[PDB]
Amino acid sequence: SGFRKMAFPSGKVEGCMVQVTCGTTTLNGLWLDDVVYCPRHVICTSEDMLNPNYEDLLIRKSNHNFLVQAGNVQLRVIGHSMQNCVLKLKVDTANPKTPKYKFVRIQPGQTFSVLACYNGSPSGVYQCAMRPNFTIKGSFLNGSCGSVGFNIDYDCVSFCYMHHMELPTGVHAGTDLEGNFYGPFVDRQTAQAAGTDTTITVNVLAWLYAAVINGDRWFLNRFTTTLNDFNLVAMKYNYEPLTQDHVDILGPLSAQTGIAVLDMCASLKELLQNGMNGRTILGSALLEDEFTPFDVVRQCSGVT
Amino acid sequence: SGFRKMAFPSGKVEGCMVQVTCGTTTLNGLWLDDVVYCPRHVICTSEDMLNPNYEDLLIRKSNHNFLVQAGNVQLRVIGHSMQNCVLKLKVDTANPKTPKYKFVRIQPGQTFSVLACYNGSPSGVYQCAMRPNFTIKGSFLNGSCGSVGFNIDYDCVSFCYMHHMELPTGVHAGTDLEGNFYGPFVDRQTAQAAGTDTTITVNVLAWLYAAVINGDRWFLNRFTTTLNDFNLVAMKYNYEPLTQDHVDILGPLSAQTGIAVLDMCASLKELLQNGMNGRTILGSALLEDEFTPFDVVRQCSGVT
Ligand SMILES: Cc1ccncc1NC(=O)[C@@H](C)OC(F)F
Ligand SMILES: Cc1ccncc1NC(=O)[C@@H](C)OC(F)F
The missing domain is CATH 2.40.10.10 (Trypsin-like serine proteases)
Structure with missing residues (x-):
């Protein structure tokens, strides 16, 4: 429930978080095996950020200029390289807590x-x-x-x-x-x-299925729609177009609840056109789009 | 931001979570030092829950009937006792991960x-x-x-x-x-x-301060109120009565933003009386009450 x-x-x-300091800038690093990953803008001062030439700024930095501290102990940097917008700091110790x-x-x-x-x-x-x-x-x-x-x-x-x-x-x-x-x-x-x-349509539908599973059912209606009809409404409300791949991903939730994906699309269509009318769904007064269909299945089943 | x-x-x-099984019931335990804490209804079958006599059900249980497993290793239970609605299972090993x-x-x-x-x-x-x-x-x-x-x-x-x-x-x-x-x-x-x-008034006000700090300011108005006037509105909307202790706890947020607590109460009063009018605050279309004033300060400052 x-x-x-x-x-x-x-x-x-x-267990992977470390502190990285270069000059006067301090930010977070991710320590996995013997590498610490961090944003390359650790080499920048606030003024450098306006127009930084990362390759040129990196030339002035040596291994000893990158201070890496994991809790209260210092890591020794034995190598450094820039890969796109991240720096990879090779350290002499593999993180014992590397998952x-x-x-x-x-x-x-x-x-x-x-x-x-x-x-x-x-x-x-x-x-x-x-x-x-x-x-x-x-x-x-x-x-x-x-x-x-x-x-x-x-x-x-x-x-x-x-x-x-x-x-x-x-x-x-x-x-x-x-x-x-x-x-x-x-x-x-x-x-x-x-x-x-834009709103993530497939996630809103997944969340409507989660609401039905948990008892919030007021929004279920007597209508159905088609993908093309639903998508005309979705365009109007800055919702992502729903595809058959999205319909397929919602298959397990549709099977568990017995509510066809297109029927749920019709409930969503009415919610977009009529609003919530001062009502709530799963404690929210707007349509939630940050639960994927996989998230809904995971939470509704108890995956650990 | x-x-x-x-x-x-x-x-x-x-690092403290363990599994506890008694008979056919399995639930979670909390392992701190050499004690595992778990709900006493671990001794109940689903049918026992209708009218359980916990003291009588516990007499039929010995240390070896409580199976405690931390990951893949079994803990030896050397003692058990009931304290109110929890069972305390003394084990022979202190949890090395006890914080x-x-x-x-x-x-x-x-x-x-x-x-x-x-x-x-x-x-x-x-x-x-x-x-x-x-x-x-x-x-x-x-x-x-x-x-x-x-x-x-x-x-x-x-x-x-x-x-x-x-x-x-x-x-x-x-x-x-x-x-x-x-x-x-x-x-x-x-x-x-x-x-x-009822809605936790002091938390809604703390969250309105967080919204002002993060840029959502549309709800700020030209009005003020008193505690007694605000409280008449709060009663009408099933909000907890606001006290001077709540006002005092909001002091740091009031000081940081320069918005007097009673002025924020007047913004809240108008939101209760007029609704959000299809608008949102911090991505919510209702008034959020699960952030305490301490939570707002902590998050807005970066406490680790
Ligand atoms: C302030 C802040 C707050 C939260 N996240 C990141 C930043 N920081 C930045 O965006 C810096 C790295 O760039 C800026 F120079 F444009
Ligand atoms: C099912 C469930 C789902 C989530 N939390 C707890 C329970 N379980 C119970 O409430 C049991 C312990 O009591 C019942 F017998 F009244």
Whole structure:
């Protein structure tokens, strides 16, 4: 009973967080095996960020200029390299707490947990989604860079995000663990406007299924629709177009509840056209889009 | 930038989770030092829950009937005792992962993180509040009992909740770590209706301050009110009465933003009387009450 915005247990990731300092800049690093991964803007001063030439700034840095501290003990840096927008600091000690891990590049609409950190220390964990405009709506203050996003499948941590930037609009941008930014964002203090933040339709439908499973059913109606008809409404409301791949992914939830995907699409269509009328669904007064169909199945079944 | 429903990093608590089995019932235990704490209804079969006599059911159980497994290794039970609604299983090995800890009994309106577990294994972490009717709105399926709620102050984990029951209305009830239920709930499968779920006024005001700090300011108005005037409106909307103690606790947020507590109360009064008018605050279309003023300061400052 009950449905919550749940993050993955963060222990496996907490054991990887380190502090990285270069000159006067301090941010977070991710220590896996004998490598520490961190944003390359650790080599920048606040003034360098306006127009940084990372290759030129890196020439002035040696291994001893990157101070890496894991808790209260210092790690010895024996090598450094820049891969896209991340720095890889080879250290002389493999992290004894390294979990089984993978680096994945997620698609927009996919969810992940963030372990927000400051100075190598974890402050909290929350669940968010990669928006269709490749931004995330996080909670990051100065010093949180290098905090990571991840998913966990049993004992394997799939790292998908590393925090780099706060856009002037208060939204966040970052990279995968190969240092490639999600979206068109760059690690420069310049005008970078995000595109339309459209709603993740397949996730809203997954969340409506979770609501039916947990008892909130008022929004179920006597109607059905087609993909093309639903999509005309979705376009009008800045919702992502629903495809047959999305319908297929909702198959298990449709099977468990006995509510055809297109019937749920018709419930969603009426909610878009008529609003909630002062009512709530799973404690929310708007349509939630940060639960994937996989998240709904996982939570509704008790996967550990 | 940004404000999220953030849970504490769960690592320190993950290291304490064990599985406890008695007969055919399996739930979660909390292993601290050489004691494993778990709900006493681990000794019950589903049929026993209708009218259990815990003292009588416990007489038929010996140390060897409580199977405690931490990961893949079995713990030897050398003693057992019932304290209120929890069982304390003395084991022969102190948990090497025992963090610095305290057992606290929280007040309604206070928030905490829950590490949802099944079979001694963590599934996820979320933040919730002890409701004014002493229930929590969690996400717990069968097998989640013994999952705990906690707060963390630097390196000390303050355990405040242990999950025991799902009320027929889908809300949750449990105990503190001394085994005393929050509210009037009992560990019996019987009619237990919750009282009015009133809104935690001081937390809504704290969250309005967080919204102003993060840029959402549309709801600020040209009005002020008094405690008695605000409280007439609060009564009408099932909001908890605001006291001078609540005003005092909001002092730091009032000082940081320059918005007097009574002016914020007047903004809240207009939001209650006029609604949001299709608008949102911090991504929510309703007034959020599960952030305490301490949570807002912590998140807005970067406490680790
Ligand atoms: C302040 C802040 C708050 C939260 N996240 C990141 C940042 N920091 C940045 O965006 C820096 C790295 O770039 C800036 F130079 F444009
Ligand atoms: C099913 C379930 C789901 C989530 N939490 C707890 C329970 N379980 C109970 O409430 C049991 C312990 O009492 C019942 F007998 F009244």
